[PDB]
Symmetry: C3
Subunit: 392 residues, 3 copies
């Protein structure tokens, strides 16, 4: 006869986990949380800032069991990393909710490991949607909540009353490292995109529309005679970009992405910046007082991602990324005094295998390294020649 | 099928606003919140400590729109100031609830702008009623709540589940400027009195009963043989005061104001200190074990208010206040080295107009100043002579 | 038509009280809360760390009334002390709930006196059960909650929606003495045992099973081939102990106490460490993969409790404790330079009376001292002789 979050939590808690990390860049220990996304494969989502530069990562279930997990993907821009429990047995995954349907008045419960105390559940409400600005270079469209969140909670779950995952708790405005009623979480629709990508490739292939923009405030809207105090203001479209071909002109106000109204430029960025190259979307435009509807196809890009350090753990040097279909890892740009280039690693190389194993993309490459060989025999291709780079 | 504050908030949020201030006393910027009290006129309530000494104040709605607002009233003792949006178009006002019916177990949601992040809503419960003591010189009868409140929230709303305003969030007990679960808000019945007054005059005309008092604790109650551990203890009544005429004698315990029980002396003070001169009230007395009922009529006073600085913004000098009916602003007491007296401002003067505009009270006077003339031509009356004081 | 904790709180708040203490060890003042356990006798429970080393303790009801209270019991290991209001008139006691039925999703409201502001009520949920580790020497099986708790709250109540007491708020993880969303409370079943004991004897007579243990983590469980990631691991049983006689062998995993599953060793300890000598319990064992059920009878012990300082307030010296049935207070072990031994207090003595009053146990002894004589005439027995120790 007493209302309680107990029943829903009895089913959902096994899905959340605590993560222990051991790394070096100097030795360090870190701790946070993670959410089991796929029970069978043992995929566990979490903040990239928790497992970053980790030599060893161990996952601990709510029932006590400890497992070892290895990395599979990690996107610093959105701060979402995907690890995988080695030897997954009898896990429970969380079902994901559609974050686009969240409304500010909604209830929320957060689950995670504050200060290593163990699985802690605290509750509150959605205080705001679309918050961004914490770190202006990243993609951020944070859900804001007043459910208590402290250090240890990162990577943990943020669920609705029905037990569905709506976000991953990431950060907190807070002077003197102590929760104050203001916490942030990446919405779940982003986790579902960034994550599935990582599963199938090892990195996120970022697509761009090709427009330069800025937040459309009330002042700029007067100067530009537009009845709208919020939205994405198009500064200029790039030549031969998706937006160009679609018909978007500078001085345009983007007001909606796929039926959904667009809080601001930051969200629009985070939205498409989370979609995979080739996705078909439709933008809601506003040029010279008239409404407009256009169809776009996200295209390639020049996304700065996966550095030779995120896959080698310590091997400073050229950045790397997938190449076309599963054609292998490509070495983006080699620096100079960076250790990677100090082993024959030159920009333009295409790692097509390692230790007699084929490397179609970053995921597979990280698989060979997962076994931890004593000597890594890279089979790359420079121009029209096949060569071999050795390591230890 | 999920309970949520969303529906109520969809209607109420447009009513709350964020306030940006620019001032000097040295230049400064400040930010807080405000609540739209009257949609048509654009009246917006807020903490006096937010807009105080402000050269410029800008209001921003939840939809993005920005407007400029000018001051109309401000009472430092209760910490309630009333500003007005210039050119109000399509606003939503909040409906006010009767704060006297609040009970400690009640739910509350607070809306405001913590650290400029934007419209943030957080929730909790009424933790206590009648808190006072924060600043012993002011009038305080605070509602206490554990809904998260931080810097930026001042001037914001505190509403019940039905969306009705029960208070204005004002302050927070909190070491290291971070919410800790203890926040305070001026109840709404006070805002409704102090505010309506300001609208119609520019200041609050304070009425007094004319009694000296003190909190009636358990100890004093023994010494005085009174069965009551709480209430207002009458130390002495002033000669020719309302209380005197009504029949109140020293050694009396005031236990109720208009049917309503009286938490303490502080509340009693804050209660009547918020009512306008001439209001008809009835006090519940307790003299020598016997219950008593008396009828009073709040009378004049010697209220220290509106200084020549709150209307001139920087012109130190004599204090000012309305005079009788709309008879104009009266200059209370001129200091000495104060800039105001340094322009011919002498105590006893009665500003009856400014720049060829009639000044019936402080509101109108602040209207002429609102246009921001280059030279302010005061038409005051010293004794039986009409004179003119110039400014720039 | 609005849901509210008000109705339940109207009945329950009178039960909680604020406590003011004056002590010395140097003079000090302290403040906290307490819960009325028995209306008739005026028994009030509270944290031992609040009233410890107190020369004077005053209790203040929610209605204003102040009373003086004297101590009756106090257990530092569990941090529960029992005081008694002198001259109890018209009090309300709280009814206790069965804490073993609490589940993590459950709602909770906390009542107490943060920073002396007065009776404050804040709410939240059960974040976790069985937390321990705060102070590794004590008995701890804390309920964890995110209802706001700050200094002043210790000794206060933690109740469920029905108004029943489920715990006593004791401490908070919190950098910079400010609530952060993590608070702890001793569950009510412990308060009900530790407390009733104190009532009937002045101290808690601690019983032990006689086993050496440790938390059974996942690692130790592999090494020991046991399908269980949590429980109490038996390191060794003591000779002629209850556990010995019952049949418990080292290398055993205790997994349940009286039907109830056992979170960990810490809980198991806190559980039985709270039961009185002679209690009949049954343990759930797990030896060599096979389940086991055994019946035990808590036995004596060597519990380090009640020091000559907790009953004399300042008289350093030999520790003391009850003796057999109501046979009087026994002086455990006298130090050397300790003031107590500096008045003829030698270990082995059996205080059998004081100032012509019989002393059956520590409660009665503290009764004679309660009247505050000028000279305390102890009638103790050394060997086969009756002697008298004088004090002032």
């Amino acid at each position: 006869q007493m209302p309680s979050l107990a029943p829903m939590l009895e089913k959902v808690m096994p899905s959340v986990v605590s993560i222990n990390v051991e790394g070096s860049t100097q030795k360090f220990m870190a701790l946070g949380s993670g959410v089991i996304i796929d029970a069978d494969k043992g995929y566990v989502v979490t903040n990239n800032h928790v497992v970053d530069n980790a030599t060893v990562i161990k996952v601990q279930l709510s029932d006590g069991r400890k497992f070892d997990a290895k990395m599979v993907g990690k996107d610093p821009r959105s701060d979402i990393a995907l690890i995988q429990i080695q030897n997954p047995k009898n896990l429970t995954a969380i079902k994901m909710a559609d974050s686009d349907a969240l409304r500010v008045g909604d209830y929320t419960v957060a689950i995670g490991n504050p200060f290593g105390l163990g699985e802690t559940v605290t509750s509150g409400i959605v205080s705001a949607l679309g918050r961004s600005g914490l770190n202006a270079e990243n993609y951020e469209n944070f859900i804001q909540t007043d459910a208590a969140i402290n250090r240890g909670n990162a990577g943990g779950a943020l669920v609705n009353l029905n037990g569905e995952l709506i976000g991953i708790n990431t950060a907190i405005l807070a002077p003197d490292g102590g929760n104050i009623g203001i916490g942030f979480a990446i919405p779940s629709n982003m986790v579902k995109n960034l994550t599935s990508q990582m599963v199938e490739y090892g990195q996120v292939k970022r697509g761009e529309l090709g427009i330069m923009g800025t937040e459309l405030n009330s002042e700029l809207a007067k100067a530009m005679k537009v009845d709208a105090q919020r939205g994405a203001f198009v500064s200029q479209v790039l030549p031969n970009s998706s937006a160009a071909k679609a018909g978007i002109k500078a001085g345009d106000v983007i007001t909606s992405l796929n039926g959904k109204p667009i809080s601001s430029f930051a969200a629009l960025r985070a939205q498409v910046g989370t979609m995979p190259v080739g996705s078909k979307l439709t933008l809601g435009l506003l040029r010279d007082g008239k409404q407009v509807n256009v169809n776009l196809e996200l295209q390639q890009s020049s996304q700065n991602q996966v550095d030779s350090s995120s896959i080698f753990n310590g091997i400073e040097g050229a950045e790397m990324s997938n190449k076309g279909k599963d054609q292998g890892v490509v070495v983006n740009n080699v620096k100079t005094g960076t250790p990677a280039a100090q082993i024959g690693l030159k920009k333009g190389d295409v790692i097509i295998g390692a230790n007699q194993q084929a490397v179609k993309n970053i995921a597979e490459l990280r698989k060979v390294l997962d076994s931890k060989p004593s000597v890594l025999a890279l089979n790359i291709q420079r121009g029209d020649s096949t060569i071999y780079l050795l390591m230890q």
